[PDB]
Design a binder for this molecule. Structure first.
Ligand SMILES: CCCCCCCCCCCCCC(=O)OC[C@H](COP(=O)([O-])OCC[N+](C)(C)C)OC(=O)CCCCCCCCCCCCC
Ligand SMILES: CCCCCCCCCCCCCC(=O)OC[C@H](COP(=O)([O-])OCC[N+](C)(C)C)OC(=O)CCCCCCCCCCCCC
Ligand SMILES: CCCCCCCCCCCCCC(=O)OC[C@H](COP(=O)([O-])OCC[N+](C)(C)C)OC(=O)CCCCCCCCCCCCC
Ligand SMILES: CCCCCCCCCCCCCC(=O)OC[C@H](COP(=O)([O-])OCC[N+](C)(C)C)OC(=O)CCCCCCCCCCCCC
Length: 178
């Protein structure tokens, strides 16, 4: 795994520990999507919501998926590709989530949906890229998708589909250019 892959993991782990020590609220005051007009130009907040997780299962599986999928993108396609997928999917998934239920949300789930769509489709359309989602892992991706869809580890399905759409779109275009 490359530097973007690892720095994200470090960030999420430190933030999660901080949320346990300080409480979710205090950390959200710093990192959440802007929740007051006076914060609308704190432009990092359109992305930093992605760094907060709300349970052990939430962060554990997100970081496993991020490490595998994000790591593959970074290794084969470069840090830049990973950064763009991450920023765009975080921004769009965050935007959709906040429109539906307000600014108090967080985590990498939307980004992971984008990376799943990206790695799966790029691998299927463009095997030469060296990127692919192994069939064994497709099994677990579907389990993880269905479980989250029914809120077993709420009400964020639309935002997640928005993330998936970003990944599928980028993979499609990238496979044409490649
Ligand atoms: C070195 C260069 C660094 C540049 C870093 C800053 C770039 C981002 C600036 C902050 C973005 C705020 C967007 C916003 O919060 O704008 C919404 C505002 C209220 O409505 O006005 C709007 O909607 C306007 C239309 C939607 C946008
Ligand atoms: C606060 C929470 C923090 C959690 C963060 C976890 C995020 C993922 C960490 C993975 C780091 C692996 C990097 C590495 O250093 O690699 C390890 C090893 C290398 O081996 P190598 O030297 O041959 O290369 O191989 C492997 O990564 C094996 C990878 C497969 C791991 C599967 C774990 C499944 C756990 C299921 C739990 C379900 C509970 C219900
Ligand atoms: C909570 C419900 C949702 C569960 C979601 C689970 C998500 C797990 C994602 C892990 C991603 C990182 C894994 C990774 O990046 O690793 C890469 C490497 C692949 O192996 P390889 O390419 O060398 O070939 C294998 C040799 N072969 C082809 C002959 C078999 O190692 C591996 O993938 C090791 C495989 C990891 C399997 C872990 C399964 C844990 C499921 C527990 C929960 C079940 C619910 C009840
Ligand atoms: C948006 C979601 C990502 C866009 C790609 C969707 C997945 C995909 O891979 O779409 C494939 C299809 C392009 O066809 P092709 O290059 O596989 O075959 C070309 C025909 N030939 C084989 C005889 C040369 O793209 C299309 O549908 C292009 C239109 C997409 C509109 C989606 C509306 C919902």
């Amino acid at each position: 795994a490359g530097p973007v892959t690892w720095v994200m993991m470090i960030a999420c782990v430190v933030v999660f520990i901080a949320m346990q020590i300080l409480g979710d609220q205090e950390v959200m005051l710093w990192l959440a999507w802007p929740f007051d007009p006076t914060l609308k130009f704190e432009f990092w907040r359109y992305f930093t919501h992605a760094l907060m997780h709300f349970s052990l299962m939430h962060i554990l599986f997100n970081l496993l998926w991020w490490w595998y999928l994000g790591g593959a993108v970074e290794k084969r396609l470069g840090s830049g590709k990973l950064i763009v997928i991450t920023l765009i999917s975080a921004l769009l998934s965050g935007y959709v989530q906040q429109k539906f239920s307000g600014p108090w949300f967080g985590g990498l789930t939307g980004v992971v949906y984008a990376l799943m769509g990206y790695v799966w489709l790029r691998g299927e359309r463009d095997p030469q890229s060296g990127i692919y989602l192994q069939r064994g892992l497709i099994i677990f991706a579907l389990i993880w998708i269905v479980a989250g869809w029914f809120d077993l580890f709420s009400m964020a399905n639309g935002a997640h589909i928005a993330g998936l759409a970003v990944g599928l779109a980028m993979a499609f275009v990238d496979s044409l250019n490649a």
